Amino acid sequence: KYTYPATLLCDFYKVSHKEQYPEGTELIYSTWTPRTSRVEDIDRVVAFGFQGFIKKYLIDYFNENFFKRPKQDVVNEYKRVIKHTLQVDDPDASHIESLHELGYLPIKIKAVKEGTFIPIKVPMLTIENTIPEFFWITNYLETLMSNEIWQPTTSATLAYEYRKILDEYAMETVGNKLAVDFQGHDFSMRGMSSLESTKLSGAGHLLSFTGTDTIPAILYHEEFYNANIENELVGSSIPATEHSVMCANGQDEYVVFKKLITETYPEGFVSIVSDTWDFWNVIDTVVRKLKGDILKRDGKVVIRPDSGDPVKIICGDPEAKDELVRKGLIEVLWDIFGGNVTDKGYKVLDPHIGAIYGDAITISRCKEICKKLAAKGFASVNVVFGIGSFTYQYNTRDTFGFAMKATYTVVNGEERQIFKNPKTDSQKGLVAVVNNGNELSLVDELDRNAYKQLSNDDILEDVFINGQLLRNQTLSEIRELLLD
Amino acid sequence: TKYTYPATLLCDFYKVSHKEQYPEGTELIYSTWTPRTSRVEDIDRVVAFGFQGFIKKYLIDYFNENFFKRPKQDVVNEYKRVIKHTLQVDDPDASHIESLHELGYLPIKIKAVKEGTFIPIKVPMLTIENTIPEFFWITNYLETLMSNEIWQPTTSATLAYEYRKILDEYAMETVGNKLAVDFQGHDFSMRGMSSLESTKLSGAGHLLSFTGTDTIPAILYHEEFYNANIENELVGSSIPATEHSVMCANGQDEYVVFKKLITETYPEGFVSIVSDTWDFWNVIDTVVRKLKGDILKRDGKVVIRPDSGDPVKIICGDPEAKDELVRKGLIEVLWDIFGGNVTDKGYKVLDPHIGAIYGDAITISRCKEICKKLAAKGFASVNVVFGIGSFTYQYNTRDTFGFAMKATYTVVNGEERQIFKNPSQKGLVAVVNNGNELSLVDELDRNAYKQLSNDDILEDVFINGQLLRNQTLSEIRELLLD
Numbered sequence: 010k011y012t013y014p015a016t017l018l019c020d021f022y023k024v025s026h027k028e029q030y031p032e033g034t035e036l037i038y039s040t041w042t043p044r045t046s047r048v049e050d051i052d053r054v055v056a057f058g059f060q061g062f063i064k065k066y067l068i069d070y071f072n073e074n075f076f077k078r079p080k081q082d083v084v085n086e087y088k089r090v091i092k093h094t095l096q097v098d099d100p101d102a103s104h105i106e107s108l109h110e111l112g113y114l115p116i117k118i119k120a121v122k123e124g125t126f127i128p129i130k131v132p133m134l135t136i137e138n139t140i141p142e143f144f145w146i147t148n149y150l151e152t153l154m155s156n157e158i159w160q161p162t163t164s165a166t167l168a169y170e171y172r173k174i175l176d177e178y179a180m181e182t183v184g185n186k187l188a189v190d191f192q193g194h195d196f197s198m199r200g201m202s203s204l205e206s207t208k209l210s211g212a213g214h215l216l217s218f219t220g221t222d223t224i225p226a227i228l229y230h231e232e233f234y235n236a237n238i239e240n241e242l243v244g245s246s247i248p249a250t251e252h253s254v255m256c257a258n259g260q261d262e263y264v265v266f267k268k269l270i271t272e273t274y275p276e277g278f279v280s281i282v283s284d285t286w287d288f289w290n291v292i293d294t295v296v297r298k299l300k301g302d303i304l305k306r307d308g309k310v311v312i313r314p315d316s317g318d319p320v321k322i323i324c325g326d327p328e329a330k331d332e333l334v335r336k337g338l339i340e341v342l343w344d345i346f347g348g349n350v351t352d353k354g355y356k357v358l359d360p361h362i363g364a365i366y367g368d369a370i371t372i373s374r375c376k377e378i379c380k381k382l383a384a385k386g387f388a389s390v391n392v393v394f395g396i397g398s399f400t401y402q403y404n405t406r407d408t409f410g411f412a413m414k415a416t417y418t419v420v421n422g423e424e425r426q427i428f429k430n431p432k433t434d435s436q437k438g439l440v441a442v443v444n445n446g447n448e449l450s451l452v453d454e455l456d457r458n459a460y461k462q463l464s465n466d467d468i469l470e471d472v473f474i475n476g477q478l479l480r481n482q483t484l485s486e487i488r489e490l491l492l493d
Numbered sequence: 494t495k496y497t498y499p500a501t502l503l504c505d506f507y508k509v510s511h512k513e514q515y516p517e518g519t520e521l522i523y524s525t526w527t528p529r530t531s532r533v534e535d536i537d538r539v540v541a542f543g544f545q546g547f548i549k550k551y552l553i554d555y556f557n558e559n560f561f562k563r564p565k566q567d568v569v570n571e572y573k574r575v576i577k578h579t580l581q582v583d584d585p586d587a588s589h590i591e592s593l594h595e596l597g598y599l600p601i602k603i604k605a606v607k608e609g610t611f612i613p614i615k616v617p618m619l620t621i622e623n624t625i626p627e628f629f630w631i632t633n634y635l636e637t638l639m640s641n642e643i644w645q646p647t648t649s650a651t652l653a654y655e656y657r658k659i660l661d662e663y664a665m666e667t668v669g670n671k672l673a674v675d676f677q678g679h680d681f682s683m684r685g686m687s688s689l690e691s692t693k694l695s696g697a698g699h700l701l702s703f704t705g706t707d708t709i710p711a712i713l714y715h716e717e718f719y720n721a722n723i724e725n726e727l728v729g730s731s732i733p734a735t736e737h738s739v740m741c742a743n744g745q746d747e748y749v750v751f752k753k754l755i756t757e758t759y760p761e762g763f764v765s766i767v768s769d770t771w772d773f774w775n776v777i778d779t780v781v782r783k784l785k786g787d788i789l790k791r792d793g794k795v796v797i798r799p800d801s802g803d804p805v806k807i808i809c810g811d812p813e814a815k816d817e818l819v820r821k822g823l824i825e826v827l828w829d830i831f832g833g834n835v836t837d838k839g840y841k842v843l844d845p846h847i848g849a850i851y852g853d854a855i856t857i858s859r860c861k862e863i864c865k866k867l868a869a870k871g872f873a874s875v876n877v878v879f880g881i882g883s884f885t886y887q888y889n890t891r892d893t894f895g896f897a898m899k900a901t902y903t904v905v906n907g908e909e910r911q912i913f914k915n916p917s918q919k920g921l922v923a924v925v926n927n928g929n930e931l932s933l934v935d936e937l938d939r940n941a942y943k944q945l946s947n948d949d950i951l952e953d954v955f956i957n958g959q960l961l962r963n964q965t966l967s968e969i970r971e972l973l974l975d
């Protein structure tokens with residue numbers, strides 16, 4: 010098998026930095042901070058992902074690929090890469106040798122509880138070396154950790170933006186939040202940039218919702234967050250057709266739909282994409298004609314449109330003159346099947362029929378759909394939203410301004426602050442995050458004495474020290490912390 | 494733990510339900526991978542890259558190690574557990590998983606253009622189908638993961654090439670050769686990639702066009718899947734470089750810090766020093782200027798790395814500034830101190846003992862603008878190395894080049910049929926050399942397709958567990974640039 014050395018998962022210049030530090034550098038202490046927000050109406054992030062990164066890479070990857078292997082092997086892989094990529098005849102690997110001899114990562118990582126709302130410009134995590142000789146290790150890990158933990162948090166925040174909307178309109182139209190868990194459904198896996206990013210993003214999505222088509226995300230929560238699908242609802246989905254299946258089955262859409270709902274899935278949920286040729290014809294002449302069969306099933310038939318303006322398809326096009334197009338999918342389905350009326354006067358479809366829209370959904374479009382459904386007396390729970398790769402893939406580390414910055418060093422016993430301040434266009438010292446009334450706040454410019462003085466109010470907790478994981482959060486606990 | 498993600502569950506959930514929804518007697522499903530549109534200006538072709546890595550890693554390595562070599566009962570149970578407790582089925586059917594395991598290999602056929610080829614928008618570049626009728630369902634099942642894994646390596650490879658394109662033309666125009674270009678596009682993006690795997694795929698795409706990179710895992714990726722060997726070829730290269738935290742740790746007497754770095758820590762070779770920790774222009778005026786003799790005595794090159802301000806103005810100058818150094822820009826000021834040479838085209842190139850690199854807020858547009866404005870001042874484009882970061886490589890979707898996996902062809906009870914929605918590609922597809930361009934041919938039945946096979950530039954890459962094409966990084970670089 011091909012091994013990527015655990016000592017070279019970084020930018021190239023991280024390798025060179027060790028010899029550049031001042032003589033007698035004994036400690037380097039770095040923080041992980043979302044420094045700004047580039048999503049409207051989002052001023053906090055949902056901290057998530059540190060545990061998965063620590064378990065997969067700092068514990069498992071370093072043990073299996075570095076510490077349990079012979080010293081000569083890891084030394085040689087490192088030296089080979091350095092020699093042939095940095096043009097060094099005899100690279101120094103004595104620090105690698107010494108780390109391997111130590112047998113564990115002399116590292117202290119602290120972090121806020123995953124599931125916590127962290128304000129912009131407030132640090133969520135810190136890392137430091139626990140043995141002076143390995144000061145260089147802190148800087149070394151900055152790249153990989155950044156590379157790994159901005160995506161799960163980012164997705165976690167974006168998903169929550171949906172949940173917050175879906176909760177509120179639910180409370181506004183129904184009076185309870187029972188349907189919201191399934192109202193946000195992850196459709197994004199094919200549009201994520203890699204399977205690993207698929208796992209991290211979908212795992213973020215699953216903090217707020219249980220509906221997903223991203224199987225590896227459910228299994229990710231099993232792998233790193235102590236979930237078990239046999240004992241708790243981690244994630245769930247329903248049988249659903251796709252355009253190629255509908256096309257293969259042919260244009261006698263009544264026969265195809267009837268076979269799908271009475272023979273292939275006579276009970277339970279089933280989602281049928283209905284726009285392969287003529288969506289409104291399927292609604293008018295197929296779904297209507299199958300009304301008795303749909304009502305006779307012990308389950309739900311979910312109608313899935315996949316083209317047009319999602320807002321206008323779901324809520325209606327006011328300027329369209331065909332009655333079905335002007336009414337919209339939800340109103341036409343109510344006209345066919347009816348349903349129930351909430352205590353606040355909003356219509357909920359008969360539970361034998363339902364709708365889902367999983368193309369071109371955005372946070373703004375989700376809010377608009379809920380608002381326009383309420384404007385005509387339909388409850389928000391009548392639509393399931395399919396959230397795609399536009400939400401979960403199309404971000405950067407800068408979408409929430411994440412950066413890992415060294416804020417504190419100890420050099421020959423002297424405590425020192427680190428910060429840049431370019432004239433061509435910040436955190437200092439040890440940091441702490443304290444609960445001040447309603448919100449969390451950053452305290453910086455702290456020496457070791459002042460940092461210890463504040464230890465009882467700091468909400469960052471010991472997560473990983475010298476190879477030992479000290480905090481092991483479950484998915485249920487994180488969901489509890491997020492949604493109370 | 495040794496947690497195993499089942500090889501049969503790397504997909505969208507509804508892929509699992511599609512098998513029973515196909516018509517009776519479905520014997521073949523055939524799908525294509527096409528970039529349908531371009532959302533990047535001046536780009537109407539993509540660099541085909543990624544298929545070999547996905548095929549080796551997942552279709553060969555992953556499936557053999559985690560599915561075919563394991564006990565049949567174990568894979569069956571791992572499938573049933575997930576389906577039962579996530580699709581709320583009491584007794585899931587796994588007889589097809591059992592049949593696949595008994596078969597012992599993936600009964601699929603994948604064709605793809607050679608990696609490194611330029612594929613125009615709306616031209617397919619990969620197809621997949623099943624080779625045994627019973628396993629018609631395999632094609633559809635594999636669509637998610639394949640799409641998950643191959644849009645990013647191509648996108649990066651395409652975006653990287655755009656930089657190369659600009660850097661090539663300007664080199665040809667201001668130097669007369671492209672020798673310096675390989676190191677002019679330098680990948681800085683790893684910390685901003687969404688995952689280590691995405692880091693690897695994107696950096697490999699970048700390394701198709703450039704040799705300069707700070708993303709070590711990308712170099713090693715080309716070793717793992719594209720037969721590269723850093724002992725015998727230059728896959729990726731980088732140089733010693735400082736960062737802001739180290740500059741702060743060394744203190745504000747930047748004369749002594751720089752002197753130590755360039756005469757003691759790295760007395761020879763390349764060394765990149767980021768110089769804007771407190772005052773970039775002061776560093777240029779009083780540190781680099783005072784160190785000119787020391788810099789010129791080195792058998793090597795000191796590279797100056799600014800990291801803040803308008804990149805175009807820092808590198809090429811700010812015409813409206815009153816300070817002479819700010820007005821001139823870094824390249825001209827360095828020229829004033831160190832001098833240099835004139836190329837065959839009449840453009841100035843810095844003395845090889847000094848250099849410049851800029852790796853913050855670089856875009857394709859800014860790289861072109863920097864080259865253009867440097868040329869307008871008489872300075873060759875090779876005076877600047879461009880650090881390309883995550884804004885280029887990460888801030889994309891599969892929709893940036895409109896990638897889609899579309900079933901286009903099926904065989905049901907021996908009847909050939911075309912698959913397409915009209916709420917497009919129909920039938921079997923081929924890509925042929927049509928004068929000077931590549932053209933899509935579709936609406937082909939099997940007979941016409943076989944007739945055209947010798948002209949199709951799509952080639953057999955994977956069949957029934959057999960790797961049929963094994964391209965090297967050097968071959969792909971040769972196809973792309975030559």
Ligand SMILES: NC(=O)c1cccnc1
Nearest residue numbers: 196197222249367505507
């Ligand atoms: N289940 C679905 O309808 C689905 C899933 C993923 C992507 N698109 C649609």
Ligand SMILES: NC(=O)c1cccnc1
Nearest residue numbers: 020022681682707734852
């Ligand atoms: N070598 C560098 O200066 C560098 C690399 C990656 C990211 N940022 C800076």
